[PDB]
C-alpha cells in the first residue's frame, strides 16, 4: 500500500455525480477535483463545494492536501485558502474556493476541475515534548511530554 | 527520535501563555496552534499573531509548514497566506492571518486555535546545477554548479554594512 | 545519487538572479523576477523568474509558496504554485496584491516567493469504491 489510494464515491452507482479525481498527465503530481453541483460564486464570495468523493485509503505515510490549480487561480482570480485532509477523515472532500474579484462571478461547472489533491509525505509524530530553555544558563526544563 | 518533535515555550514556567500546539485526534496530521495575545483583526486586515512557542527540534527530514484550518477559514472568512518554518529558525512561531471580510472583524482569543502546523518531508538539496538548453539544436551549456557546504573549510567572518 | 540533486534551466543565453537558499537551514530557494512591474491595488500578477526545473530530486516536486516578508510587508499572497515533474517551461510566480490603495513594486533585486522540493507519492495503483463495490480500478 506504499503507492496506492482508494477513493470512496458518495453517490450510489446508478446516480449522476462529479467526475472522479484524475491526474491529467503521467507527470501531474495531483488529482484534479471536480464539482458535484454547479454554481456561480459571487464577487468577493467564498464557496464550499462538494467534490463527490472521500479518501477511503491513503498511500503509506501520506495525507491529502487540496491546493489551487494555476488556471482556476489566474483565469478566474481565485484561491483555495485551506485544504488539509486528515488521515482519519471519513467524509466527502469539499473544496473551499475564494473569489477575489470585486466585479466578476466565478462559474463552477461539472466538467471543469476546481482544485487539485496532492498526496504529501508528512511525519506522524510519535514523541513530543514542550521545553522551557533558560537563555542565561542554558537550562532546559521539560514542561510536558507525550508519546502517541 | 526520528519521529519526535520538541517545542520551546518562550514564557517562563510560572507565567500565563498560549495553549500548546496539539493534534486534535490520532489521525490529525497537524498541530493546532493557539495565540498568546488577543486582538480583533479589522475588515480586510492582516495580523501577525504570536503563538508562544518555537520549534527546538524538528522530526528528521522534515520542516514545519503553518497552514490554515478549515473552520477558521470558512467560519471567519480568513486565510493563512504564508507559513514556511526553516529548520535553523530559533524564534517564536507567528501566524500570519488575513481577514477577507469587508465588514466584519475577526476575534483572536486565547484558547481558540488560529492555524495548524504540519511536519512535511522535504529535500534538503546537496547538489545543484544551472544549465542553458538551446531550444532549436538541443545543445546544453553548464552555467554554474554548487555543492552545499559541509564544514570542510573554515574562514574568519568579516562584518557587513 | 539524484536523491538530493536539482538542475535548474536558465532561459536567458549565457535576466534574473538564480534561485538560492538564504542559509544552510533555509528549506526553500528564493525566486527572483526576470521582469519589473508595479502590481496595482487588488491586482494579480504572473511574474517570470527566468528559470525552469530541468531535473527534480528523486520523489519530489516543486511547490512555490510565499515568503513571510513579501506577504507581511507588501500585503500579498502566492495563491498557486504546484510545479508538475513533467513541466519543461519557465517557473512563473502568481502574486496577488491585497491592498485596496497601494501598488506592489516588483524589482529584480528582491525575491518574490520561494520554491520547496516536497516529497510526494506518485500513485501507482488507484481504485474508486462505493461503500463495498469496486467502481473503477487503474494501474499507472
Ligand atoms: O479544504 C478542506 C479542508 C478540510 N476538509 C475536511 C477534511 C479534514 O480532515 C477536516 C478538518 O480540517 P481541519 O483540521 O483543517 O479543520 P478544523 O477547523 O480543525 O475542523 P474541525 O474542528 O471541524 O475538525 O475537514 C475538507 O473537506 N476540505
Ligand atoms: O508564517 C510564518 C512564516 C515564517 N515564520 C518565521 C520562521 C521562518 O523560518 C522565518 C522566515 O520565513 P521566510 O523565509 O518565509 O521569510 P523571509 O521573508 O525570507 O524572511 P527573512 O529574510 O526575514 O528571514 O520566519 C513565522 O514565524 N511564521
Ligand atoms: O505558480 C505556478 C503554478 C504552476 N506553474 C506551471 C507549472 C505547472 O506544471 C503548470 C500547471 O500547473 P497546474 O497543474 O496547477 O495548472 P492547470 O490549470 O491544471 O494547468 P495544466 O492544464 O497545464 O495542468 O503550470 C507555474 O509556472 N507557476
Ligand atoms: Mg494541472
Ligand atoms: Mg483540525
Ligand atoms: Mg526566507
Features:
homotrimer, mainly beta, Deoxyuridine 5'-Triphosphate Nucleotidohydrolase, Chain A, four-stranded antiparallel beta sheet, 13 strands, binds deoxyuridine-5'-triphosphate, binds magnesium ion
What does this structure look like?
The structure is a homotrimer. By secondary structure, the first copy, chain A, is mostly beta strands. The first copy, chain A, has one domain (1-148): Deoxyuridine 5'-Triphosphate Nucleotidohydrolase, Chain A. The first copy, chain A, has one helix and 13 strands. Chain A has one helix spanning 70-76; strands at residues 4-9, 31-33, 39-41, 46-50, 53-57, 62-67, 78-79, 84-85, 94-99, 106-108, 115-121, 127-133, 140-147. A four-stranded antiparallel sheet of chain A has the order 2-11-6-8, with no helix packed on it. Chain A has a three-stranded antiparallel sheet with strand order 4-9-7. A two-stranded antiparallel ribbon of chain A has the order 1-5. In chain A, β12 (127-133) and β13 (140-147) form a beta hairpin. Chains in contact: A-B, A-C, B-C. β1 of chain A pairs parallel with β12 (125-130) of chain C, so a sheet runs across the interface. The structure holds deoxyuridine-5'-triphosphate (DUT) (3 copies) and magnesium ion (MG) (3 copies).
Amino acid at each position: 500500500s506504499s503507492a496506492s489510494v482508494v477513493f470512496m464515491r458518495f453517490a450510489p452507482p446508478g446516480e449522476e455525480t462529479a467526475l472522479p479525481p484524475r491526474r491529467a498527465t503521467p507527470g501531474s503530481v495531483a488529482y484534479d477535483l471536480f464539482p458535484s453541483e454547479e454554481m456561480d460564486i459571487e464577487p468577493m464570495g467564498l464557496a464550499k463545494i462538494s467534490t463527490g468523493y472521500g479518501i477511503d485509503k491513503f498511500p503509506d505515510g501520506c495525507y491529502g492536501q487540496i491546493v489551487s490549480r494555476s488556471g482556476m487561480t489566474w483565469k478566474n482570480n481565485t484561491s483555495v485558502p485551506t485544504g488539509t485532509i486528515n488521515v482519519d477523515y471519513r467524509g466527502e472532500l469539499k473544496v473551499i474556493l475564494r473569489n477575489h474579484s470585486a466585479e466578476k462571478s466565478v462559474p463552477i461547472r461539472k466538467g471543469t476541475s476546481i482544485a487539485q489533491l496532492i498526496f504529501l509525505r508528512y511525519c506522524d509524530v510519535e514523541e513530543e515534548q514542550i521545553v522551557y530553555i533558560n537563555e542565561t544558563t542554558g537550562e532546559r526544563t521539560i514542561i510536558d511530554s507525550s508519546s502517541k
